[PDB]
Motif scaffolding. Structure first.
Motif, PDB file in Angstrom:
ATOM      1  N   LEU A 146     -21.105  -8.198  -5.319  1.00  0.00           N
ATOM      2  CA  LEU A 146     -20.923  -7.720  -6.486  1.00  0.00           C
ATOM      3  C   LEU A 146     -21.942  -8.083  -7.718  1.00  0.00           C
ATOM      4  O   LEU A 146     -21.928  -7.544  -8.459  1.00  0.00           O
ATOM      5  N   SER A 147     -22.645  -9.250  -7.250  1.00  0.00           N
ATOM      6  CA  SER A 147     -23.634  -9.832  -8.006  1.00  0.00           C
ATOM      7  C   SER A 147     -24.910  -8.836  -7.995  1.00  0.00           C
ATOM      8  O   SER A 147     -25.772  -8.932  -8.925  1.00  0.00           O
ATOM      9  N   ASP A 148     -24.922  -7.697  -7.165  1.00  0.00           N
ATOM     10  CA  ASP A 148     -25.950  -6.538  -7.140  1.00  0.00           C
ATOM     11  C   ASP A 148     -25.832  -5.625  -8.630  1.00  0.00           C
ATOM     12  O   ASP A 148     -26.683  -5.189  -9.087  1.00  0.00           O
ATOM     13  N   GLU A 149     -24.692  -5.896  -9.281  1.00  0.00           N
ATOM     14  CA  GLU A 149     -24.395  -5.426 -10.682  1.00  0.00           C
ATOM     15  C   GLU A 149     -24.654  -6.438 -11.532  1.00  0.00           C
ATOM     16  O   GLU A 149     -24.319  -7.723 -11.730  1.00  0.00           O
ATOM     17  N   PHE A 150     -25.275  -6.225 -12.941  1.00  0.00           N
ATOM     18  CA  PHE A 150     -25.823  -6.808 -13.808  1.00  0.00           C
ATOM     19  C   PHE A 150     -25.960  -6.057 -15.223  1.00  0.00           C
ATOM     20  O   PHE A 150     -26.324  -4.793 -15.042  1.00  0.00           O
ATOM     21  N   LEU A 151     -25.880  -6.865 -16.229  1.00  0.00           N
ATOM     22  CA  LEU A 151     -26.015  -6.096 -17.510  1.00  0.00           C
ATOM     23  C   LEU A 151     -27.647  -6.388 -18.284  1.00  0.00           C
ATOM     24  O   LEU A 151     -28.057  -7.525 -18.189  1.00  0.00           O
ATOM     25  N   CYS A 152     -28.177  -5.542 -18.237  1.00  0.00           N
ATOM     26  CA  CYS A 152     -29.779  -5.490 -18.721  1.00  0.00           C
ATOM     27  C   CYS A 152     -29.832  -5.489 -20.210  1.00  0.00           C
ATOM     28  O   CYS A 152     -28.627  -4.617 -20.732  1.00  0.00           O
ATOM     29  N   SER A 153     -30.720  -5.794 -20.999  1.00  0.00           N
ATOM     30  CA  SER A 153     -30.728  -5.092 -22.322  1.00  0.00           C
ATOM     31  C   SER A 153     -32.207  -4.971 -22.374  1.00  0.00           C
ATOM     32  O   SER A 153     -33.122  -5.646 -22.098  1.00  0.00           O
ATOM     33  N   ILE A 154     -32.619  -4.081 -23.367  1.00  0.00           N
ATOM     34  CA  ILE A 154     -34.025  -3.609 -23.645  1.00  0.00           C
ATOM     35  C   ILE A 154     -34.124  -4.023 -25.298  1.00  0.00           C
ATOM     36  O   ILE A 154     -35.390  -3.688 -25.489  1.00  0.00           O
ATOM     37  N   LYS A 155     -33.312  -4.786 -25.880  1.00  0.00           N
ATOM     38  CA  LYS A 155     -33.377  -4.746 -27.516  1.00  0.00           C
ATOM     39  C   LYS A 155     -34.352  -5.989 -27.754  1.00  0.00           C
ATOM     40  O   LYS A 155     -33.892  -6.949 -28.350  1.00  0.00           O
ATOM     41  N   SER A 156     -35.675  -5.849 -26.904  1.00  0.00           N
ATOM     42  CA  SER A 156     -36.468  -6.945 -27.331  1.00  0.00           C
ATOM     43  C   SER A 156     -37.578  -6.330 -28.535  1.00  0.00           C
ATOM     44  O   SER A 156     -37.560  -5.139 -28.392  1.00  0.00           O
ATOM     45  N   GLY A 157     -38.414  -7.170 -29.043  1.00  0.00           N
ATOM     46  CA  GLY A 157     -39.349  -6.681 -30.292  1.00  0.00           C
ATOM     47  C   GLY A 157     -39.108  -5.849 -31.119  1.00  0.00           C
ATOM     48  O   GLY A 157     -38.165  -6.215 -31.890  1.00  0.00           O
ATOM     49  N   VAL A 158     -39.681  -4.451 -31.117  1.00  0.00           N
ATOM     50  CA  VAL A 158     -39.248  -3.739 -31.964  1.00  0.00           C
ATOM     51  C   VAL A 158     -37.875  -2.906 -31.685  1.00  0.00           C
ATOM     52  O   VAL A 158     -37.052  -2.896 -32.565  1.00  0.00           O
ATOM     53  N   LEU A 159     -37.609  -2.760 -30.449  1.00  0.00           N
ATOM     54  CA  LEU A 159     -36.450  -2.276 -30.072  1.00  0.00           C
ATOM     55  C   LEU A 159     -35.068  -3.105 -30.532  1.00  0.00           C
ATOM     56  O   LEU A 159     -33.915  -2.689 -30.548  1.00  0.00           O
ATOM     57  N   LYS A 160     -35.232  -4.405 -30.850  1.00  0.00           N
ATOM     58  CA  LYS A 160     -34.532  -5.389 -30.979  1.00  0.00           C
ATOM     59  C   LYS A 160     -33.622  -4.743 -32.479  1.00  0.00           C
ATOM     60  O   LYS A 160     -32.398  -5.099 -32.279  1.00  0.00           O
ATOM     61  N   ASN A 161     -34.142  -3.801 -33.161  1.00  0.00           N
ATOM     62  CA  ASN A 161     -33.564  -3.384 -34.297  1.00  0.00           C
ATOM     63  C   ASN A 161     -32.941  -2.171 -34.220  1.00  0.00           C
ATOM     64  O   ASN A 161     -32.198  -1.497 -35.172  1.00  0.00           O
ATOM     65  N   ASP A 162     -33.200  -1.358 -33.063  1.00  0.00           N
ATOM     66  CA  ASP A 162     -32.791  -0.082 -32.698  1.00  0.00           C
ATOM     67  C   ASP A 162     -31.372   0.110 -32.815  1.00  0.00           C
ATOM     68  O   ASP A 162     -30.665  -0.455 -31.632  1.00  0.00           O
ATOM     69  N   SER A 163     -30.526   0.661 -33.757  1.00  0.00           N
ATOM     70  CA  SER A 163     -29.052   0.708 -33.663  1.00  0.00           C
ATOM     71  C   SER A 163     -28.554   1.827 -32.518  1.00  0.00           C
ATOM     72  O   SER A 163     -27.556   1.781 -32.130  1.00  0.00           O
ATOM     73  N   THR A 164     -29.568   2.669 -32.360  1.00  0.00           N
ATOM     74  CA  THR A 164     -29.341   3.684 -31.438  1.00  0.00           C
ATOM     75  C   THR A 164     -29.243   3.301 -29.904  1.00  0.00           C
ATOM     76  O   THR A 164     -28.695   4.284 -29.079  1.00  0.00           O
ATOM     77  N   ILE A 165     -29.552   2.133 -29.429  1.00  0.00           N
ATOM     78  CA  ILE A 165     -29.650   1.595 -28.197  1.00  0.00           C
ATOM     79  C   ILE A 165     -28.454   0.556 -27.923  1.00  0.00           C
ATOM     80  O   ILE A 165     -28.147  -0.163 -29.033  1.00  0.00           O
ATOM     81  N   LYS A 198     -27.388  -1.239 -11.369  1.00  0.00           N
ATOM     82  CA  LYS A 198     -27.135  -1.546 -10.026  1.00  0.00           C
ATOM     83  C   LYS A 198     -28.355  -1.566  -9.269  1.00  0.00           C
ATOM     84  O   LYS A 198     -28.935  -0.724  -9.252  1.00  0.00           O
ATOM     85  N   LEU A 199     -28.580  -2.786  -8.370  1.00  0.00           N
ATOM     86  CA  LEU A 199     -29.608  -2.998  -7.352  1.00  0.00           C
ATOM     87  C   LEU A 199     -29.051  -2.376  -6.165  1.00  0.00           C
ATOM     88  O   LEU A 199     -28.067  -2.544  -5.557  1.00  0.00           O
ATOM     89  N   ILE A 200     -29.657  -0.839  -5.746  1.00  0.00           N
ATOM     90  CA  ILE A 200     -29.018  -0.029  -4.882  1.00  0.00           C
ATOM     91  C   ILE A 200     -29.168  -0.625  -3.285  1.00  0.00           C
ATOM     92  O   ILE A 200     -28.094  -0.339  -2.696  1.00  0.00           O
ATOM     93  N   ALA A 201     -30.126  -1.300  -2.875  1.00  0.00           N
ATOM     94  CA  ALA A 201     -30.526  -1.512  -1.424  1.00  0.00           C
ATOM     95  C   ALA A 201     -29.747  -2.870  -1.016  1.00  0.00           C
ATOM     96  O   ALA A 201     -29.547  -3.258   0.046  1.00  0.00           O
ATOM     97  N   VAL A 202     -29.126  -3.474  -1.882  1.00  0.00           N
ATOM     98  CA  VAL A 202     -28.731  -4.746  -1.749  1.00  0.00           C
ATOM     99  C   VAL A 202     -27.494  -4.746  -0.717  1.00  0.00           C
ATOM    100  O   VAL A 202     -27.398  -5.687   0.341  1.00  0.00           O
ATOM    101  N   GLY A 203     -26.917  -3.762  -0.601  1.00  0.00           N
ATOM    102  CA  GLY A 203     -25.880  -3.403   0.627  1.00  0.00           C
ATOM    103  C   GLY A 203     -26.556  -3.314   1.926  1.00  0.00           C
ATOM    104  O   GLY A 203     -25.962  -3.793   2.913  1.00  0.00           O
ATOM    105  N   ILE A 204     -27.724  -2.970   2.014  1.00  0.00           N
ATOM    106  CA  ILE A 204     -28.561  -2.915   3.359  1.00  0.00           C
ATOM    107  C   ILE A 204     -28.910  -4.323   3.481  1.00  0.00           C
ATOM    108  O   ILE A 204     -28.808  -4.761   4.730  1.00  0.00           O
ATOM    109  N   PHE A 205     -29.665  -5.198   2.669  1.00  0.00           N
ATOM    110  CA  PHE A 205     -30.219  -6.412   2.636  1.00  0.00           C
ATOM    111  C   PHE A 205     -29.260  -7.496   3.282  1.00  0.00           C
ATOM    112  O   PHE A 205     -29.313  -8.049   4.294  1.00  0.00           O
ATOM    113  N   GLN A 206     -27.934  -7.337   2.570  1.00  0.00           N
ATOM    114  CA  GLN A 206     -26.859  -8.326   3.111  1.00  0.00           C
ATOM    115  C   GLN A 206     -26.478  -7.968   4.669  1.00  0.00           C
ATOM    116  O   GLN A 206     -26.003  -8.722   5.368  1.00  0.00           O
ATOM    117  N   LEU A 207     -26.839  -6.632   5.055  1.00  0.00           N
ATOM    118  CA  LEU A 207     -26.252  -6.278   6.283  1.00  0.00           C
ATOM    119  C   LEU A 207     -27.456  -6.738   7.371  1.00  0.00           C
ATOM    120  O   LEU A 207     -27.084  -7.621   8.313  1.00  0.00           O
TER     121      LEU A 207
END
Lengths: 302, 302, 302, 302, 302, 302
Positions: free
Chosen positions: E178-197, E204-213
């Protein structure tokens, strides 16, 4: 290293098979980079999925009796769909006579040229000292009509397949180009009741302009091959020179001027020999001696 | 290992065939990475499906008499569509004279060079001891005009095909570039009545700018080949050196200075020999002896 | 197994042809994985189809006199579009001098090295016993200026093609990068009247940043090749060692110290021999004997 | 079948060239299956076409002085764009010293090993019976510094190219990763006035995380190659064993213990011989005889 | 045709390299037909372009310290991204010991087997008539520990690389899926101020289930290789049969029962010989004679 | 040219490996032209990006304990995902016994057949004149159980791997097809709180219909291989003819009718010999003599 198949028939085969396969290889694989073979004008209210459904449905409908209308009836729409396969059919039907010959005749003949060549060297080598076995042998091969009939039929098969292609292509070219447009409908089954669907979708087969063009090219080329194939049957006239006379100048040879106007395998041997015996030094020597003569101690000064 | 085809004709063939095939290989297969050969400006109200329908419909319309307008008439729009095939036609029509030669002449000639070379070694080997068979042979090959006519015609075919390409390309280049824009319409059949469709779709053939560029390159190169092909006919002047004189210095040879100004196969033999006999040690030796002489016991000190 | 072409010219050819073909192979085929060579900023009101129409239309417009504006005029926009072909032109024009040499000279020369090598072995083999044919032969090859002129011109062709590339690339690099942006318009024909279309579409040629970079790399490399090609003309200085002196130490040899400062084919032979005769055991032996001598019975103890 | 290039230099070349080409082959061709090298966050009001325009525009802008902002200035954004080519540059600059050697030295040397081997067999074969030509020869090759300088320089070129890669990669790795984000703008030309467009588009170069990772791998490996290349210069210590002593045990040989601490080509011969002479049975026999001796009739019992 | 590398080491190499390269070749190149390695759930208000921006941005963010959250910290997200390269690293590090051996030992050994085989034929051929050079030679190869140390280290390198892979894979498998799921954010730089984001994008990293197998498969296989590699060090026990006794039955041979329990190269020779000498007819004959004996005139009746 | 591996085992291997690799090659690489392995029915309110997110998320979820529901539990969803690898596992596990044999036995045996054949020619050649070394040799190979145990185990490995495939495939086929539908959910993490997302997404694994079909084909074929492998163990009955009797008719041979019902390597030799000795003219001659006899001067009339 023998010239086991006549260059004429190699040429005719190389053209008659090479041409349509090339033509197919052109019009499809590269220009299908334009993408689609059919398109139909949906209403604007259609989702992109629904429009893609119409195109793919009508692509199937072109061969189905009720789902169509054209003044031609459905018939030519088959041809537009199946066009490359119809060419491929002709390509295959012209390759087989050679593949047949490559097995039914080639290993049956290769023995005999090698045999006759060595016999001709005996005739020459015995002349150098200055039974008619190969003469009596070839005199007997006069009395055969086996391998010539394999050849005649191999040509005759090739002839018919070519001629049918010419008629077929003429029809496919004579086909009125605007028959590439037709009215489809998808109102089958459940969709039969859907008022949101128009009663017809107009469609166009995109590549038809290419195929009618290609058909004229292929038609004219095959119209050229026809008289060449006809010439193949002039076998007694195809025997160009009685090269056996060049050996007949020797006392170790005989008057085998056997330009048989009957359909005798010996005449067919004469053709392949008149091709292959160009390889023989003895032939060259005797042709040289003949040509210069145009005394046998001369052969000692060779 | 014989030089069975003249480097001039190999060069001319390698250019005349290699160039257009290269040009096709360039403008299409890579730059079609730009995607599309045609596009048309739909209304904005068109669904993406409907717009794709317009493009693909008009791509077919370019050869159909009524569906178009241009000041040129429809004619040049054919050329823009079929342009690669027209080049490919010229490519094929130039390959065949070589493929013809590769079968109609090459196995007819390879015998004779090998024969003549050995005869020249006899002439030399007999000189080393210090009938005119090959001389009388070659003296007779004077009296032939068979293989030269295969050559002349092979060149003449190549000449005509090149010249027609130059005229055709000049026309295709002279074609006013802005004729790449034309007005299509899809208001056929059912769509004939559709008020939502504009009476014309403006369209542009994207690649025309490449083809007119390519045409000038190919035009100029073929304009260069023309005088080279013309030079091929100067056969009596193409006989550069009477190398037979180098053997004629021997008593075992004769005054075969047969620079025939008549169209005699012997002159064509002289060309291929003047190419190939560079291989002979005997030629080298006799050329060396000649060049040094510029006494036959000298040959014993070789 | 002969060293039939000088390593310098192989190197120069391998660079001068290998470099631009590599450069093309890089900037296009892989980085076109970025997709598009041009893009133009449509209004937002444009359908995706209409926007794709603008891009593909303007891609054609770049060579059309009226459809454009830039302070440069249209000229450089041609270069950006045609850039890979212009490199390919230079690549081809540098390959041909080698392909020319590979046919006009190589089969003309291969005979002579083999001949001279055997003569040098005779000189050595006759020394082992302890007419000047090859000496008189080579003394006569002094009096020729045929094959050297094929070489000089082959270099001179290569020189000019390189130099023109340097000027052309310098121009293409000096081209102000911001000229990659230009104003297109599609208001031709019917669209001329469309008020919904802006009078200009701003566009950018995406790859121009790569090409100007590549141009500087290729410029500097060709600027390096220039003095190397110049050095090729220093032929009398390129004759490094009078290896004929190593044979001249034999009584079976002569003072062929023929470092011709005139443009004489013999000097060109000296270069290829000074390359190839490194293969000869006799050369090694005589160089060894010379180097040790730095008595002929010594050769019996070899 | 000779060992014409030292395994050390083959290894160094195989690594120094094989590594970066592998690294390029990894990070691009497969992981570009993720699709895009750059992306920029458009407003949501942008059509998909307009958003694609922004990405492709900014991809060009990265090298253009005014169209950008970063605390680094524009400089590193060049490197991120051009990164694979910069590796490819190092790959090429390391291949050339071997390709140089493969032509400037290999055909210059192959003669000499074959010669020396046969001379060593003479020394042995003459011993079996129980002038110093090769000894005097090799004693003279002491007095040369030609081919060693080709070798030293070939190594020295390879050394410098490696060292510059290490500095360059260290810089590219030291580059603060967050410099992969930058502010683009498209407000040039006409779009300069468009109020609907934001003053900046934030962008990220996606692959930078891979390249900085790859740079550390390649940096460490090249840091390992450095001391290996340094060791190549310890030539007088690289002469491992005076195998000439094994022959010097014969009366047919001499005290050629010529571990030259001066930069003499003979020492370089010693290295290649110490490699290649492992092939000689005579060496094996004499090494065996030496090793057992650790009486010459013994050689008759071999 | 010699068996120059032990089948055990060929097997171990063929597995240890072949396995991971196969595993990479499976999980990526085919199943990436599923398309994407990462995805993130945008808001529905995002344009498709903006959503594609999020995915590609977060794909870069996974290695950047602040742009992430997971209970693991960032560390394992590196591994998921770089996973194929980490396998490829192990693959390369296992190939090199063989490539090392293929150059550092193989051409050093091939000489000696050929030598010893001929000596064994002498021993046999001299027996047929019914100095101990090879015996004294091999008796001296007892006193060497050079090539065995190349072998031991080659194995030891291979051992360590395998063992590190096992630990690494165990960690990568022990990694909570389940560490294949994580929280990203793009609110860097200009987008730091964007309330719409949104403040986070879940990803989710899709292939992780294959690699652990895949990791468990590769882990277990390498856990099997470990005891095999350990067995390679049991060299004195790996000497299976004192085949030298089969020759020692001859008077032309000696008691070379040199199963050295010290680390002596002779023992390593015994292994390769015990492999290769199966080829010798003499061995077969003497083994046959031995096995039958389980009188030397018998050899005359062979 | 020896028949070093039994045709039965070649057939069994060629089937047992060739079949599953073919099956994989079919169902995936071509029919994945249908595109997708999974799909899930989003709400219509989802953007296309969000819908693509659901599909790719659930593709990972299939192996994760909580993210799923089915009456089967999660277990079979693993199999549907990993299905090709499970076949590939069986393919690999069947190739290794042959690759093992190709190294553990083949170079151990090839010596012996060549030896025995020459001995059989001695027996015949000595008969032509009208110690029992090979007889005593083969009489001793009776007393071995080494190579037979390599064979038995190689078969036994192959047997077990096949049998496990049959059970596994039977389970995978017995799996209720409708288990290909399952309920996913993406309400993890942040999305856990999103009211706009449904609590379940229904999904279907598209290819399951192919795999269950393929499983029945592969199951039945392997069920056929089982009795064939069983027959391989009937070794004493697999010895078809005591061809040694054909030599035993000679006085130069012995009653080696050694159809060992004990597990003795000699019996395994009998099988390979009964295969290979068909090559021997001597066998043919003696079989002919035997068959005709069904007097030794007869051998002189051969």
């Amino acid at each position: 290293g023998l010239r086991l198949e006549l260059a004429v028939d190699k040429m005719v085969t190389c053209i008659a098979v090479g041409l349509p396969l090339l033509l197919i290889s052109l019009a499809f694989a590269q220009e299908i980079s334009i993408g689609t073979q059919i398109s139909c004008f949906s209403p604007s209210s259609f989702s992109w999925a629904q429009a893609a459904f119409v195109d793919s449905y009508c692509w199937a409908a072109v061969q189905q009796k009720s789902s169509l209308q054209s003044e031609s009836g459905n018939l030519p729409l088959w041809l537009h769909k199946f066009f490359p396969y119809i060419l491929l059919l002709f390509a295959i039907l012209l390759y087989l006579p050679a593949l047949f010959w490559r097995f039914s005749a080639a290993p049956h003949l290769c023995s005999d040229l090698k045999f006759i060549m060595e016999e001709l060297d005996k005739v020459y080598n015995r002349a150098i000292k200055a039974y008619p076995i190969v003469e009596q042998y070839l005199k007997t091969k006069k009395n055969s009509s086996h391998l010539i009939m394999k050849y005649i039929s191999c040509r005759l098969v090739t002839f018919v397949v070519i001629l049918l292609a010419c008629i077929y292509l003429s029809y496919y070219f004579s086909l009125s180009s605007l028959s590439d447009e037709f009215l489809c409908s998808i109102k089958s089954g459940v969709l039969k009741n859907d008022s949101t669907i128009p009663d017809r979708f107009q469609c166009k087969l995109i590549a038809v302009g290419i195929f009618q063009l290609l058909s004229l090219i292929n038609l004219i080329v095959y119209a050229l091959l026809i008289p060449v194939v006809v010439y193949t049957f002039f076998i007694p006239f195809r025997q160009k020179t009685d090269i056996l006379k060049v050996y007949e100048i020797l006392p170790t040879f005989d008057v085998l001027h056997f330009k048989s106007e009957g359909y005798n395998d010996l005449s067919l041997y004469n053709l392949f020999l008149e091709e292959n015996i160009s390889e023989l030094k003895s032939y060259k020597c005797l042709k040289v001696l003949e040509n210069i003569k145009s005394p046998m101690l001369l052969l000692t000064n060779l």
